[PDB]
Amino acid sequence: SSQVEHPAGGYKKLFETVEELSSPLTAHVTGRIPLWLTGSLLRCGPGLFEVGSEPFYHLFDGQALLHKFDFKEGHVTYHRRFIRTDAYVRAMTEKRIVITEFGTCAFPEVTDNALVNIYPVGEDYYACTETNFITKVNPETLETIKQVDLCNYVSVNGATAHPHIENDGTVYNIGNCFIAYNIVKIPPLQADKEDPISKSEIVVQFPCSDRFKPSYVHSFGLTPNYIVFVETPVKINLFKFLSSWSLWGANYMDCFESNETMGVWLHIADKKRKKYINNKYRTSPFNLFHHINTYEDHEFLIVDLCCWKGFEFVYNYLYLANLRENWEEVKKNARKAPQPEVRRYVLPLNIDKADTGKNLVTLPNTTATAILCSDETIWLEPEVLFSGPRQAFEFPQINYQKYGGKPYTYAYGLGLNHFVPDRLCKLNVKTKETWVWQEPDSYPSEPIFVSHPDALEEDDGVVLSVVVSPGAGQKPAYLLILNAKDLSEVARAEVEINIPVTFHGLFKKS
Template sequence: MIYWLGLYPAGISALSSSSNYIGSEVCKERELVSLPLPSNSIDVQAIEVKDIVKQEIIPVREITEREVKPLQDQYLKGFSSGKVNVHYPCLSIQGTFPDWLTGSLVQVGPLRFEVAQASAHYWLDGFAGIHRFTLNGSSVSYANTLLDTTYYKESCAKGTFSGLEPQKSKGSFFSRVASALSSAERPVYDNVNTNVMCHCGQLCAMAESSHSWVIQKDTLKNTQQVTYSDALDPQFICAHPHFDNTRGQWIGCGIKFGHTSEYIFYSLNSHSFERTVIARIASSYPTYLHSFGLTPDYIVLLEYPFTVNTYDLALNGKPFIQNFNWNAKQPTLITVIDRISGKKIATYKMPAVFALHQVNAYQMNQKIIIDIAAYSDASIIKALELGQMHGSQRTHFPCAYLTRYTLDLSNKKGQSATICPVALEMPDINQKYAHRSYKYVYGIGRTVQRPDVLADQLVKIDVTNGNVCIWHEPLSYPTQPTFVPSPNACSEDEGVILSTVLDGKTGMSYLVCLNAQDMKEIARAYVPGHIPFIMHGGFYSNF
């Protein structure tokens, strides 16, 4: 049974696994300034930070030496309800958006956190909303819609957040187990505030359950549920399916919980709603799986030691995510699966880490390279409780670092290395380079002096050498960057970055547009209100 699903990452704490470092210092204005590194760092070499900040520049030396100050701005507005069902046809613009940038940035996330007298306990318990920025030459508009999901309607009827407490089953121990694990008895969880995907010409909003909604283009309303024409019925759906441009198909993963649970990897052709099973991988204690890796020939399953006993899900009465437990003594298991036969090729035991997002994976000779945003443990889960954020003791968010695994298929040995000592989460790349060798990743990051925020800067990392570019404006809090390539681009990073930013000085939000090559600001469009922090989204030229 699924009661709470979906997570948002960002953070700040050093890795404690036995990874190596590629890069250790920041070169700014020809002066090398040491950054604090995890104690396990070796193979140190210089990396460059290019000069990219808006207005006030916070020098690297000041970042490392300044004392942490208490929150004194409107950052927490990002975790509070925004205005719903609004449409602003003409936003105020500073700068000039590129003429070629026409289309819509569509994002999902929690939009409302209260019902009757009840408030959401976790950040992603908030009711799902769709956000759309439409760009057309010199004009930018913004609209949002609070989605009319079953989760929302049931919560309104009950006056509390539906699904936060498990439904009590009556009867014997065995009947309660059977009821809890039965697909037929599962409550509907369709709070689709986690991700979006475009399939069969329709934009679909997703939760981490089997229930998704089609979003209407004109109104942004959820018009109909996505219905698959197959017999698969997983309780859990990985929120980050991959689209394979070469084969024209989605690759996704679901989990079926049972006495022996299983990961179900499947393909979905671009013009079909029938999923085809690629592989079923049994697991006694399944991990919390938010994303996985994909290459042209292989699926890469990462099982972190943040796992659940299925009978705890059934019987102990806790919300879904609270049933998972962290075990630092257990390894991270990385299993490589053949995409054609569905057979396991190899399983690699690596130091214990936790991650929500993989960045990219590809093949090189007889090796698989997979990059993730890795935490030292799963404490980010606890940090996302709203009570922690609004309490007298501010949450200190753990930090994820860009970490590379090299898996040798010939000798079945694996290695790990942390590429850059700058925090990175919510990664995005040029999707033309998905599943192939690439150079750049973009994400949200965080300065050392603000451990109480998810993110206060946007970062660009060169994965080949650890070089990093940073956009930072004091008291501004960006959300996941979206890379949009320029027409007829000649290089991987030729394009722009779009991100929704909360201005902590005014409590309002704006859309920022950066040059993806040097991370300098091109333009921004102001929204007359605040937008709660979003989860994921994408840029669509025809939506």
């Protein structure tokens, strides 16, 4: 949890427009940048929060800004460029908001405002939002290369910003299809050297709980043998969605509603046999954005999640007007919001009818339960790994390359305090111990884990975070490096200019 109030209101700098740079800045290093750290921290977020006099209203409406911190021989540069998407380009051309964004209707056609994440496919990198449009980008220069329409290649209306990437380059993702949820597989770059997106395919299909209302889906789980998909009670209303949007003045945010009665439905598929397994896993209602990690343990799937307790859409609390309020009013606004909680669910894969009425979770080191009912629904109760009052452990990361989809022990996260990001956290998921890094009037980003080249242990490496520090007599922002063992500070690299909020990113080794 946090131990800090924010009465100065410096978090408002997270949502303040910035200019792109025409070339890299030098970042002033204090402490010592590890000499094994060679490569680029690439991150995405909004950078332009109004087009002239017309404002964007939602957190997810600002125009995509691609950020790069470069590391070589203990020295650090910083560079950033807006992504030349149709949304950005046409707004610059016409000097107004042209494309309708998530929570901002344009007045007189789907957004490609790729503000959320960036990921590798073959030898290319792609910025994304959660739509059918992804944007190829150049990771050295930050130049926009092209727009890609996923509809051209596979049958999906969108894809998440959280594809899973296996160690050989294979990419898996999930998307709505207007009625199912499709898993897309993009194969690795082959000897023919043609772009792998042209070899995309739908491998497996999950069913929908409602014919006319699919659930919002933000991420999913992957193990060597299984795909896990959590169907939440946050629904997309397709009657409102597919009507004339310039007629009654709609945006995406206006199409979401909450099913009060369904709770949460969890779904598994067999990955290698490409097959939906018909186990009716059920539990109480929550919003879900990020899976932490999933893995197999004997005949059980361990499903670690960042949850929000309730069925109201948490996105309702992320309008810029609210996030720009003063601290007492921020706290007040979050009182009635869903409560964040880290939870472990355990999904049995061997369902014996003879155990009807009993707990199937026979593993020795969990309190999670799964109860087989007579109607063959399997009711789940979680083990709570972390809980704090309006203190979210969010934007989780692990040592993904070696432990993703596999038994693990450590997760890193960004700590939210009534939605305001004010600390960095580490969680031991076996013992429930936590470590915190926190400074006053300092607003960090998602921590990203980088392994040491000779690591013997899971947490042998660093986490990198971009921190905004609007206290005057401090520099506006800096790149933070913490030791992944205890979250003790290793170095920071200060820059001369503000940096707005960023969501997700990656470290690209060189």
